[PDB]
């Protein structure tokens, strides 16, 4: 199997790549520079490196080179704290880190950019089942879980998207989004799948954006509503060669919904997370006019399902398809993450009569105690493993002293002693992370 730029190389290598307004790329032109840095990059024999990058031209030349190098590429979130992007490097053993913006971080090696076929000029071959990228979750919302990407998946969340917001060969795309995140790097590949214009640009300025889209016969933007908004303000009061505006990641509004489709703007809204290497629930302009709350239906080979819903329908979100992820690569004690192939999400929707998917709350992975972190996963881990108890979810509990403290929920068919339970946890827990209010109940909150 050929690489997918060299393919684009050799099938449409005239084709533009890439914009970021002053230059411009063709797909051999792409192609040709990639491979040149290729041979720089392999000489370091780091099969895992970390990116430490900007939206531009010369980060996505980088970002394709490690790619044709048989290179796994760790994205670094570049509003981090240099504490917060050593652990996460080291977590997952790089040293090495290639920069296009000045990086300086102690105890790695950081290199900036001074310096027909791959298989004839690489000696590499590609393979699906490749490690592309590796992205780390938020740390605010729970531990920050390093999330392998594979070829195979990045490519069925392509032709997922294809099918439901729907891209061709004559797309322009232009991608504000951080390059680091998926919903910035998701844009690239299918680019490179597809074979169409990416228009790549730094930062958000909004009237600089809608010069953009008047001028530059863009067809396709991914935004968040709030940045939606700030461009309809400019001036964005028809699509003039918009094809698919794809919102995702923030709240919806009715009345935004409303504006939108009055200025006739196609606007899709979606739901995804970085294990499903960008959206898997897709709402068009149609279904957001019916549903204003929904995130919308999945694609043809992607399953999802409730566990254990209410009578409401409410409970856990459940997803399996080629586009989810093989499992974490760190934290290595996730032991939960998977129930019979399907992943889950930990977000609370439901699926009505019609197959519209709604987001409503997250199980929350994050217990702050006591200026502590503490992991509910954890947890549930040690207390799964008591006698008896089939069950549990430890969840956030208000106290006074401590602002919140764990609590324990536990499905058991027995009679369990709450002095038993706390002394195994505590020879299987550091003290602090053991709860101190339990529950018996019947079914999990």
């Known amino acids: 199997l050929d690489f997918w730029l060299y393919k684009q190389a050799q099938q449409n290598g005239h084709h533009i790549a890439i914009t970021d307004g002053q230059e411009s790329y063709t797909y051999q032109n792409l192609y040709c520079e990639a491979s040149l840095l290729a041979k720089r990059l392999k000489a370091y024999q780091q099969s895992r490196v970390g990116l430490y990058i900007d939206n531009s031209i010369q980060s996505i030349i980088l970002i394709h080179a490690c790619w044709l190098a048989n290179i796994e590429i760790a994205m670094i979130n570049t509003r981090l704290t240099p504490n917060e992007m050593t652990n996460q490097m080291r977590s997952i053993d790089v040293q090495l880190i290639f920069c296009t913006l000045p990086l300086e971080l102690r105890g790695f090696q950081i290199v900036s950019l001074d310096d027909e076929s791959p298989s004839n000029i690489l000696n590499t071959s590609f393979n699906l089942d490749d490690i592309a990228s590796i992205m780390f979750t938020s740390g605010t919302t729970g531990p920050q879980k390093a999330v392998p990407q594979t070829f195979r998946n990045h490519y069925a969340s392509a032709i997922g998207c294809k099918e439901s917001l729907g891209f061709d060969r004559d797309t322009n795309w232009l991608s504000v989004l951080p390059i680091y995140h998926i919903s910035g790097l998701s844009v690239l590949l299918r680019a490179v799948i597809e074979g169409f214009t990416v228009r790549i640009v730094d930062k958000f300025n909004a009237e600089q954006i809608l010069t953009m889209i008047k001028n530059e016969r863009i067809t396709h933007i991914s935004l968040v509503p709030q940045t939606l908004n700030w461009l309809m303000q400019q001036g964005l009061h028809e699509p003039y060669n918009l094809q698919k505006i794809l919102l995702g990641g923030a709240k919806l509004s009715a009345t935004m919904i409303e504006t939108a489709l009055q200025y006739n703007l196609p606007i899709y809204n979606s739901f995804g997370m970085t294990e499903t290497?960008?959206?898997?629930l897709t709402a068009t302009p149609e279904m957001l006019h019916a549903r204003p709350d929904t995130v919308g239906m999945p694609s043809a080979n992607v399953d999802v399902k409730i566990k254990n819903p209410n009578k409401e329908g409410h409970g856990e979100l459940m997803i399996k398809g080629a586009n989810v992820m093989?499992?974490?690569?760190?934290?290595?004690?996730?032991?939960?993450?998977?129930?019979?192939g399907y992943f889950n999400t930990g977000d609370i929707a439901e699926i009505d009569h019609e197959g519209y998917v709604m987001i409503y709350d997250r199980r929350k992975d994050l217990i702050i105690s006591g200026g502590e972190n503490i992991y509910?996963?954890?947890?549930?881990?040690?207390?799964k493993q008591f006698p008896g108890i089939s069950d549990a979810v430890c969840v956030g509990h208000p106290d006074d002293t401590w602002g919140q403290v764990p609590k324990l929920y536990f499905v058991s068919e027995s009679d369990i002693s709450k002095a038993q339970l706390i002394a195994y946890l505590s020879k299987h827990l550091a003290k602090y992370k053991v709860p101190k209010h339990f529950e018996k109940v019947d079914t999990l909150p």
């Open 277 to 280: 290497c960008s959206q898997f």
């Open 326 to 340: 093989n499992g974490y690569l760190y934290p290595t004690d996730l032991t939960g993450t998977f129930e019979n």
């Open 376 to 383: 509910p996963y954890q947890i549930e881990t040690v207390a």
